[PDB]
């Protein structure tokens with residue numbers, strides 16, 4: 001997250017850290033959202049490689065021990081059937097991970113609330129992006145969870161030539177674009193929390209930013225619109 005601030009230890013309890021085994025150590029690679037005691041929602045392109053993944057909940061400082069973390073393995077990975085590694089602009093960047101064991105809920109670990117299917121936010125709706133991603137284009141990961149105010153930019157505006165144009169589909173959500181704040185590599189798969197009727201709900205899964213940079217004016221961070229996949233998500237958690 002570029003241009004953000006450190007978040008409160010208990011501000012975003014549904015945020016998780018997806019890490020892969022690097023030799024004999026673990027390295028953070030993406031964010032995600034706990035939607036069930038044993039199910040995590042994240043980005044498909046985050047789990048395209050055949051690596052060994054683990055999920056960390058109750059996490060705040062990636063480098064230190066907060067005394068609130070729970071480490072659990074990933075038993076099964078369910079990528080959306082239409083995902084295409086070579087075409088992130090085609091959409092469908094979403095995946096579900098069944099954890100090896102159910103986690104215990106508390107002040108630091110809670111489930112994220114998903115919006116009703118088909119829900120579309122009005123232009124300039126108040127949302128926040130959170131993550132341990134890069135704090136600068138070509139910089140380094142953050143040590144502590146960061147957050148940044150990132151209002152939405154409706155489809156009509158985001159798909160106009162002055163912004164992302166045709167690269168953006170109606171199955172996506174755009175937020176930010178002020179050239180100062182934005183998501184960055186490492187925030188992918190993480191949530192976009194938006195205030196709706198006095199409650200924060202996860203409306204997006206961080207998907208991509210500009211090849212030319214993370215914080216680029218008129219090039220808002222692009223997210224997978226969660227409300228477009230509610231039926232899919234429910235069918236997976238019920239079957240698998």
Ligand SMILES: [Ca+2]
Pocket residue numbers: 059060061062063064065066067069
């Ligand atoms: Ca820690």
